[PDB]
Every structure is written in structure tokens, then in C-alpha cells.
Ligand binder design. Structure first.
Ligand SMILES: Oc1ccc(CN2CCc3ccccc3C2)cc1
Ligand SMILES: Oc1ccc(CN2CCc3ccccc3C2)cc1
Ligand SMILES: Oc1ccc(CN2CCc3ccccc3C2)cc1
Length: 460
């Protein structure tokens, strides 16, 4: 059996509204309903990996796993294997995979983050799973963020707490948060961002939904506007939304949105909103294509409709050579020329770089850069030609061109990262000086840039 170079991944997010599901939920896993839906001709073709995120989930783990497995069994005639299940309060993540992948999956990690403080600690937060699939690292986050139209800034703070504190992936990547640890990271959930229009416009909104005219509503979606203004989810992608708002429905139908203020809502309006979302972030120049993004129309036990998204995702093979793993391949090298960082810092410490990659035996520390004052105030940290020559473990171009180098710029005084980024080795040419670039972030916010030239030598 050849190792795959692509897999398909199903992502589901459903806020179940504390109610048991209906007897049939197969439409969710088939990507059928409204939006970008899956072709009927693919119904019997299993995805490689199913990742199910629930919020307000009233079921036990056993009860939900039996429903999920029996659903997929009916659709595909495949008995899926449980990779991981993790629950925080009523927030849950399940990862299922084809049985043929059991030996391809390793380094399974789970974690959760509880958001907020006192009053605001005890039901919101996130759960996550990571693992390796052959040579590819995969991360998955299911978050239930703070509710309420007037709490977008709290949701943004919940996001930053989750990506700072969720401990997934390779712990050796100590300067890096989850936004840099994975070849592919999927972040989904009841993110709770709302369509920010006046309360008086509720019936106008409903009209627009009935006309399938989502444009004037999406222009006020808080997640899209906060992303455009770089307030949250920096460097994540979302597929275009072409389905109706998934919240807040009257239960047992999808014919009615329940938006008006009630004691049960804390006297808050719930204008129709796209609360339930799937976003992703993949390393540069790795294949990732969204092939469905939509909501079901026939699952009506909750005041939310389930959301689905599916992806093609590039994967690589667990490379063995005569040499690496367990030695270098003197044939291979990575050289850096004319490199500098630009930092948005008022500090004047010296800085050095660390280079982290699973193509290295271990991470490499550079010498200190030369600080220069940027013409518009910034700090320019010059490395020129001084950066180390990296010695990959395998020099075969079929391996090396698929790799990535994580970069952290650290203070010499404190050894704290001021910025993290990633460079693809998927170059247009080898043995050729070529421009490289990454933005640098810390705690998920932009802190600067790294740029220069690279020179990659492979065995070919
Ligand atoms: O080649 C690229 C360059 C920039 C982006 C990031 N995008 C750009 C547009 C946009 C609009 C609204 C909210 C977020 C974003 C983020 C993606 C690909
Ligand atoms: O107020 C200023 C006046 C001159 C410079 C010029 N330097 C020179 C070298 C260099 C190397 C790498 C990146 C940038 C630069 C810019 C910068 C700021
Ligand atoms: O450590 C170095 C890194 C890059 C360069 C080459 N470039 C970088 C950009 C720039 C901008 C403005 C004036 C000059 C330059 C010189 C030189 C030294």
C-alpha cells in the first residue's frame, strides 16, 4: 500500500443546546444542506479523519462516540477508530480515523484551556487534539467563546488566551504557540461572533436571509470585521460563507429565528448570526483546499444548526534514508544571506535567532544580530551573512523541499521570544539565492518581520 500524499479531513462544529441529537445526523457528515456542499457522487467515500467539536453537549463520551461511529458506519461501511476524545465541561472534541491509518498516527496530545476569571470562569474555553500523521503534524481546536453581541473584545481575549495556553504538539518547540506547531491547524467552534446591526433591524435581517442575500449581513459579521482589522485570528483562513446564519433558531424547525430579548437570554437580543465557524492555518506552500463549508438543514434539536467543513490536506511520508534519521546527509545544506528582522519593540536588548525544524537533529542558535534604528522608529536587527549553515538530516530533494524552518527571535538578556515565524523550503530553484519572508508574531499578534535570501543545496 503506497503512503498517501493527500488526505481529506472533515471538521464539524455543533452547539447542541444541551439537547440530545435526533436519530439521524448523517447529513452533517455528508456535507449536505446549505452553503458549499459535497457532491452526491462522493457520499460513500470516507474522509480519512473526522474531527467533531461540540458545545453545550449533554451526552457522555460513550453515548456520543456510539452515535458518531454508528453514523459513519451507516454512511461508509467503515468502522472508524477513535484517535482521541477530550471534554471540558460541555465542550468536546472527538477525532476518528480510518482503521488503515492507525499505524500512521502517533504523538497524540490533548489539552484544554478555561477562559475568564471568577464570574467568567466555569463554562467557556477550548479543547484540542494534536497528532502526527506520517511526516505531517495536525492540530485541532474546538472553542466555545464568550457569548453576547457586545462582547467581541472578550472573544478576542479568549482567542489569545487559548492560543497562548493550549499545550499541544511538540513540546521541544518551546518558543512556539499552537499557531506555529502544526503543518495544518484547524480552529472551529461556537466562536459566538455576531452580526452587528441595530436591534430594530431584526425583521430586515430575517427578510435578507429569506432572500438568500447574505452580503449586507456578512459586512457586519464581527469575526470578518475583527479579522480584517487584525484584531483576532491573524494569519488564519476561512472559506466564503454561503449558508444562512446558524443561530438562533426555534427548536424542531429551521423556519424561525428566535432573536427577541427574554429573561432566559439575560434580556439580550440574539440577532441571527454566524456563531459556528471553521478556520485554518497551514504552513506556507502546503496544499490545503476547502471542499465544503455549510450548515445542515435537517438537524433541529438545538437552537444552532451544525456546521461542516472538509479539506484536502497535503501530507508527507515518514522518510528513511541510508543516512537520516540518526545522522546528517553532508550532501544537504540551508544557507541564509542578506537577512534582517524588523521588530515593533521599544526595547534595545541584543537579539539572536533560533531555527527549529524536524529536518534538523535539534534546534540551532545563531549569533547576535547588529541593531540599527529604523527610519520610521522600528528596530532593525541585521544578521547579514552571519547566520549558521543548517545541516538537514536528509538531503533528498523529495524530502527537503517539503520541509519548513520555524524562526524565533529571542532577547539575549531574557531568552524570551519577541517573534515567531515560518519559512517554506518549497523553493523555485536549488543552489540559487532566493528571497524569503515571514511575518513575526508573539502571542498571535504581529511583532515584526524577517526577510532575506536563502540558498538550498539538496542531493540533486
Ligand atoms: O495572499 C494573501 C494575502 C493576505 C491574506 C489575508 N487576508 C487578506 C484579506 C482579508 C479580508 C478580511 C479578513 C481577513 C483577510 C486576510 C491572504 C492571502
Ligand atoms: O534612519 C535610517 C537610516 C538609514 C538606514 C539604512 N540601513 C542601512 C542597512 C540596512 C540593512 C538591512 C535593512 C535595512 C538597512 C537600512 C536605516 C534607518
Ligand atoms: O544585514 C543585511 C541584510 C540585508 C542587506 C540588503 N539590504 C536589505 C534591505 C535594505 C533597505 C534599505 C537600505 C539597504 C538595504 C540592504 C544588507 C545587510
Amino acid at each position: 500500500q503506497p503512503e498517501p500524499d493527500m488526505i481529506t479531513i472533515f471538521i464539524g462544529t455543533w452547539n447542541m443546546g444541551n439537547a440530545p441529537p435526533p436519530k439521524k445526523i448523517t447529513s452533517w457528515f455528508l456535507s449536505k444542506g446549505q452553503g458549499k456542499t459535497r457532491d452526491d457522487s462522493a457520499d460513500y467515500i470516507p474522509h480519512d479523519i473526522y474531527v467533531i467539536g461540540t458545545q453545550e453537549d449533554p451526552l457522555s463520551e460513550k453515548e456520543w462516540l456510539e452515535i458518531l461511529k454508528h453514523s459513519l458506519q451507516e454512511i461508509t461501511s467503515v468502522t472508524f477508530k477513535t484517535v482521541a476524545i477530550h471534554t471540558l465541561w460541555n465542550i468536546r472534541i472527538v477525532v476518528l480515523a480510518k482503521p488503515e491509518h492507525e499505524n500512521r498516527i502517533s504523538h497524540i496530545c490533548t489539552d484544554n484551556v478555561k477562559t475568564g476569571i471568577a464570574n467568567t470562569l466555569g463554562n467557556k474555553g477550548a479543547v484540542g487534539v494534536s497528532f502526527m500523521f506520517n511526516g505531517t503534524s495536525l492540530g485541532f481546536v474546538n472553542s466555545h467563546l464568550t457569548s453576547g453581541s457586545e462582547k467581541k473584545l472578550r472573544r478576542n481575549q479568549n482567542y489569545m488566551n487559548i492560543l497562548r495556553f493550549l499545550a499541544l504538539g511538540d513540546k521541544k518547540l518551546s518558543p512556539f504557540n499552537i499557531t506555529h506547531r502544526f503543518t495544518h491547524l484547524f480552529w472551529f467552534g461556537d466562536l459566538n461572533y455576531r452580526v452587528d446591526l441595530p436591534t430594530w433591524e431584526a425583521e430586515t435581517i430575517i427578510q435578507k436571509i429569506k432572500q438568500q442575500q447574505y452580503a449586507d449581513l456578512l459586512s457586519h459579521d464581527q469575526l470578518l470585521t475583527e479579522r480584517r482589522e487584525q484584531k483576532v485570528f491573524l494569519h488564519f483562513e476561512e472559506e466564503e460563507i454561503t449558508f444562512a446564519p446558524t443561530y438562533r433558531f426555534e427548536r424542531l424547525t429551521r423556519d424561525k429565528y428566535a432573536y427577541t430579548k427574554q429573561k432566559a437570554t439575560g434580556m439580550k437580543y440574539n440577532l441571527p448570526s454566524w456563531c459556528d465557524r471553521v478556520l485554518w492555518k497551514s504552513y506556507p506552500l502546503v496544499h490545503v483546499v476547502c471542499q465544503s463549508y455549510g450548515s445542515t438543514s435537517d438537524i433541529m434539536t438545538s437552537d444552532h444548526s451544525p456546521v461542516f467543513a472538509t479539506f484536502e490536506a497535503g501530507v508527507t511520508s515518514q522518510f528513511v534514508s541510508k543516512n537520516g534519521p540518526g545522522t546528517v546527509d553532508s550532501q544537504g545544506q540551508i544557507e541564509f544571506l542578506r537577512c534582517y528582522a524588523t521588530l515593533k519593540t521599544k526595547s534595545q536588548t541584543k537579539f539572536y535567532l533560533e531555527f527549529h525544524s524536524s529536518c534538523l537533529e535539534s534546534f540551532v542558535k545563531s549569533q547576535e544580530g547588529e541593531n540599527e534604528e529604523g527610519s520610521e522608529g522600528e528596530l532593525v536587527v541585521k544578521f547579514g551573512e552571519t547566520l549558521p549553515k543548517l545541516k538537514p538530516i536528509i538531503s533528498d530533494p523529495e524530502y527537503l523541499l517539503d520541509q519548513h524552518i520555524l524562526i524565533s527571535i529571542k532577547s539575549s538578556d531574557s531568552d524570551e521570544s519577541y517573534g515567531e515565524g515560518c519559512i517554506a523550503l518549497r523553493l523555485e530553484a536549488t543552489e540559487t539565492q532566493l528571497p524569503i519572508y515571514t511575518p513575526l508574531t508573539h502571542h498571535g499578534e504581529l511583532t515584526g518581520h524577517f526577510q532575506g535570501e536563502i540558498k538550498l543545496q539538496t542531493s540533486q
